[PDB]
Design a protein around this ligand. Structure first.
Ligand SMILES: *[C@@H]1O[C@H](CO)[C@@H](O)[C@H](O)[C@H]1NC(C)=O
Ligand SMILES: *[C@@H]1O[C@H](CO)[C@@H](O)[C@H](O)[C@H]1NC(C)=O
Ligand SMILES: *[C@@H]1O[C@H](CO)[C@@H](O)[C@H](O)[C@H]1NC(C)=O
Ligand SMILES: [Cu+2]
Ligand SMILES: [Cu+2]
Ligand SMILES: [Cu+2]
Lengths: 336, 343, 258
């Protein structure tokens, strides 16, 4: 016969939301017909409980907990940082502007890229926001030959659409969204006759979708120290990590690790291509000393055989005449 | 504009009883404004439907259903088996007969206890019996020093009151009650010429015309449907709410009768076993056979527990009982006297 | 210290659908704190159980019941036969091609299109949980006005567009829909040929919305004979009836009734 189930089997769950918006926190056995005398259903939250970023809804007590160390919650939203292939739900539709069908938003890698040739490539996402939210995406705009249009269609398909060019950094953009079945549009036209520079978009984050998320273990190469992190910080260079790691594990000397690397890689031997020649300033006697230096991100070990060392240099060689408009002193340190 | 509610949104309810005594089983939604086209009202029962003990009134068809398994209904009555505190409705009025104010009927535990000293401690209950009924309570009367009075004053305050002594068992008492606002009184006085008077399981019948099925309390099990009283689980068996049968307990755990949860068996101690000596053998030597107390709740496997000591060595008996001649002594017939060796 | 929950207090209800689609039939008191020892939860339908027109979902035994006499269920759909005002959810947006006054006027029995040269769009944005169809009776007496009814997709992508003339009484039209948030458009633009009769639309019936729906009492003047009726038949002339009636009572000699 069935016996009363310990706290290891019944899991709290929410009933279907009614017209007024009331729910019952019914305690449901994991598998049917294992126990009786289950906890009495109690009043739930009014169908609109939205835990903030880095928090998950605890069913035992209806409140937002700060999650655990090494895990992220993403809040009431989603993120599309991965772009190896087209993420599920995105429609990279391409249509002629009047054959350019070959041109489309290619998932180049950690970033997506726009079509260089003259064609209309629309990156469409249709997400149903149960709650009002925003979309936050970093977009790279190298050249003005390709225009960038980002407009949000409403629930009734009834539509600021043009984006500003970006210089230097990746910049940051954000707009507001409503409770309807919003459809986000990302399209680029190449009205320039002569070429191009593709447009890059990263880190598309839409918030206010499912009212609640669950804590996710951090991906390899990412570490989270403080609880409630809405993201996992990337491990610095020469540091490796794995899933759920609270701190990045230091790597061995013979192995080099890139930023956010899951596993270390053996340092190759130094080659002639690793070091670059250079010349420093002149001395008091007017002679410059050349001091060969390794590249700032140098990756090679001196101990390994077959590795050319940093060549011995620094011999004082008389400098040529100084720059025009500059006259040297007794110390040969030219001043304007 | 509104719905046509199914069986899940409309509940049956009885209208207010009129002067003649007729009720209409009208259909009512669970919350206002949720549905229309409710089932038409029909004639209800004549304001006097009283389901027997162990039954509940089913509204769909106006009849007494036999309830479910493992649940009791108590019928058209109430019970006061619990006495950790004074149950609601009881007035433990204590007054000096002519300070004893600190002396009154105290909720000792599973049973209530009377005041031992010389004072008038009255336990009064005011219950309005909607139907003719009786009261069934168990009263312990250890000694005649303290008298016990149980008189139910009637509706008009209008008043064999003394209860006879009880020997051996707890005994059982019952008197008849009328439809009036009967007010039960339990009072005891000590003559101080002691042993307190105890009362358990006060059962008053004919109160609310109808009750509802109740899940069996932990430590209690009910097998057959329609049980007025939920039975008690045997010793070494545990149970929970709504259990049809008692679950057997583990060997390393001991459980008292009607226990909600099992208790770990402690290690046997020197106090658990008791010494004793049996009868003599053919040679006249008695063998001592140590025994454990039958409420043995300890385990031999646990360390630090003294085992039953190895006993049974034949030890010569003293001279047999006077008037008995042996080595199985038999009663010497009347007219002959024995000191244990010869008659 | 709580009474065992009688059959009249607990009301069967489904838990929230998970990703896979499993639901539990948990038993819930009608108000908190009433019952204890409620019936155990059991497996429910896989978030897609739909009852056809004329049937409702009985939670006690998770199957479709045939409803009852004199009640229409509408099934897993909706209906807009009434047009006294603009029905809720319908946007009679009119865009100049000023013609702000011109739009789809909601006459009592039917909705009428515009007569002038202004684009009048009757939009209904509906979310379909299940793939279904849309049906309506459109009157197209004159060909000067062009009638367009095209279904927009979930991703707002456009998706046979135009309609044929409906001579000899009201005709019947129906197109398929999809799982997405299809947004229906009705639009009529009249060519200014100096001459027209507006397009008339009735009985818009969209199926596949909101999964299972419940039965409703028959509207006044309409009757249903047997259980499972997806619609209440109109009472014959010279006869009258009221809500919930299974038959139309005859009328008095000195009275008439359409
Ligand atoms: C245009 O034609 C088809 C699709 O319309 C496509 O397969 C083909 O590759 C296109 N032409 C070129 C030159 O890419
Ligand atoms: C009189 O009775 C009161 C009430 O309990 C008590 O507190 C007080 O001690 C009594 N006086 C005595 C015992 O002298
Ligand atoms: C101009 O448009 C307004 C609505 O915006 C309308 O009320 C008005 O009648 C129009 N003017 C004319 C001459 O029709
Ligand atoms: Cu109810
Ligand atoms: Cu068992
Ligand atoms: Cu009739």
């Amino acid at each position: 016969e069935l016996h009363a189930c310990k706290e290891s089997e019944y899991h709290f769950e929410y009933t279907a939301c009614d017209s007024t918006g009331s729910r019952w926190r019914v305690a449901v056995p994991h598998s049917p017909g294992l126990c009786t005398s289950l906890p009495d259903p109690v009043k739930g939250t009014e169908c609109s409980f939205s835990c903030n970023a880095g928090e998950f809804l605890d069913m035992k007590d209806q409140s937002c907990k700060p999650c655990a160390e090494g895990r992220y919650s993403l809040g009431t939203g989603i993120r599309f940082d991965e772009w190896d292939e087209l993420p599920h739900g995105f429609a990279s539709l391409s249509a002629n502007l009047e054959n350019c069908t070959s041109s489309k938003w290619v998932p180049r890698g950690d970033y997506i890229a726009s079509n260089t040739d003259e064609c209309t490539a629309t990156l469409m996402y249709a997400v149903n926001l149960k709650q009002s939210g925003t979309v936050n995406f970093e977009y790279y705009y190298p050249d003005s030959s390709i225009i960038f249009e980002f407009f949000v269609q409403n629930d009734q398909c009834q539509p600021s659409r043009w984006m500003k060019t970006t210089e230097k950094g990746w910049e940051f953009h954000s707009v507001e969204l409503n409770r309807g079945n919003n459809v986000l549009y990302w399209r680029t036209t190449a009205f320039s006759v002569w070429s191009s520079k593709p447009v890059l978009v990263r880190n598309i984050a839409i918030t206010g979708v499912a009212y609640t998320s669950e804590c996710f273990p951090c991906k390899p190469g990412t570490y989270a120290a403080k609880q409630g992190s809405p993201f996992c910080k990337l491990c610095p260079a020469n540091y490796y990590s794995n899933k759920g790691e609270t701190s990045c594990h230091p790597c061995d000397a013979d192995k080099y690790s890139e930023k956010g690397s899951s596993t270390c890689k053996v340092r190759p031997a130094c080659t002639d291509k690793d070091y670059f020649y250079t010349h420093t300033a002149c001395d008091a006697q007017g002679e410059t000393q050349l001091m060969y230096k390794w590249a700032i991100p140098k990756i090679c070990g001196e101990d390994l055989e077959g590795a050319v060392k940093l060549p011995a240099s620094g011999v004082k060689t008389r400098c040529p005449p100084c720059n025009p408009g500059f006259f040297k002193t007794d110390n040969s340190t030219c001043e304007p | 504009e509104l719905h046509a509610c199914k069986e899940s949104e409309y509940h049956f309810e009885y209208t207010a009883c009129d002067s003649t005594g007729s009720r209409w089983r009208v259909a009512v939604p669970h919350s206002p404004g949720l549905c229309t086209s409710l089932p038409d009202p029909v004639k209800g029962t004549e304001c006097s439907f009283s389901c027997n003990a162990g039954e509940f009134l089913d509204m769909k068809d106006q009849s007494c259903k036999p309830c479910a398994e493992g649940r009791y209904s108590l019928g058209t009555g109430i019970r006061f088996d619990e006495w950790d505190e004074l149950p609601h409705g009881f007035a433990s009025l204590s007054a000096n007969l002519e300070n004893c104010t600190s002396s009154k009927w105290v909720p000792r535990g599973d049973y209530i206890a009377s005041n031992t000293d010389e004072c008038t401690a009255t336990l009064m209950y005011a219950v309005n019996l909607k139907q003719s009924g009786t009261v069934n309570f168990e009263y312990y009367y250890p000694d005649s020093s303290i008298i016990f009075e149980f008189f139910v004053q009637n509706d008009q305050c209008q008043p064999s009151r003394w209860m006879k002594t009880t020997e051996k068992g707890w005994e059982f008492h019952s008197v008849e009650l009328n439809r009036g606002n009967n007010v039960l009184y339990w009072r005891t006085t000590a003559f101080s010429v002691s042993k307190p008077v105890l009362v358990r399981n006060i059962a008053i019948t004919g109160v609310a015309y109808t009750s509802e099925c109740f899940p069996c309390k932990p430590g209690t099990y009910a097998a057959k449907q329609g049980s007025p009283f939920c039975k008690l689980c045997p010793a070494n068996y545990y149970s929970n709410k709504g259990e049809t049968s008692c679950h057997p307990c583990d060997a390393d755990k001991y459980s008292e009768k009607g226990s909600s949860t099992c208790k770990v068996r402690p290690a046997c101690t020197d106090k658990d076993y008791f010494y004793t000596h049996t009868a003599c053998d053919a040679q006249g030597e008695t063998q001592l056979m140590y025994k454990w107390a039958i409420p043995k709740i300890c385990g031999e496997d646990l360390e630090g527990a003294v085992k039953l000591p190895a006993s049974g060595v034949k030890t010569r008996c003293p001279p047999c009982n006077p008037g008995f001649f042996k080595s199985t002594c038999e009663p010497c017939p009347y007219g002959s006297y024995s000191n244990g060796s010869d008659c | 210290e709580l009474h065992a929950c009688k059959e009249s207090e607990y009301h069967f209800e489904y838990t929230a659908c998970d990703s896979t689609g499993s639901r539990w039939r948990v038993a819930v008191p009608h108000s908190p704190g009433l019952c204890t020892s409620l019936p155990d939860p059991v497996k429910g339908t896989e978030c897609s159980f739909s009852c056809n027109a004329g049937e409702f979902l009985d939670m006690k035994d998770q199957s479709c019941k045939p409803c009852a006499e004199g009640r229409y269920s509408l099934g897993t759909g909706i209906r807009f036969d009434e047009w006294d005002e603009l029905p809720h959810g319908f946007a009679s947006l009119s865009a100049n091609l000023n013609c702000t006054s011109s739009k789809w006027v909601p006459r009592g029995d039917y909705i009428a299109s515009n007569t002038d040269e202004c684009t009048a769009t009757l939009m209904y944005a509906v979310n379909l949980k299940q793939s279904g169809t849309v049906n309506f009776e459109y009157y197209y007496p004159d060909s000067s006005i062009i009638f367009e009814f095209f279904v927009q997709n979930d991703q707002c992508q456009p998706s046979s567009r135009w309609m044929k003339t409906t001579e000899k009484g009201w005709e019947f039209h129906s197109v398929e829909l999809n799982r997405g948030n299809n947004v229906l458009y009705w639009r009529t633009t009249a060519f200014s040929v100096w001459s027209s009769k507006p397009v008339l639309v009735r009985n818009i019936a969209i199926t596949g919305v909101a999964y299972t729906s419940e039965c409703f009492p028959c509207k006044p003047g309409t009757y249903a004979a047997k259980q499972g009726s997806p619609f209440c038949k109109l009472c014959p002339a010279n006869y009258y009836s009221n809500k919930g009636e299974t038959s139309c009572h005859p009328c008095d000699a000195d009275k008439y009734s359409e």
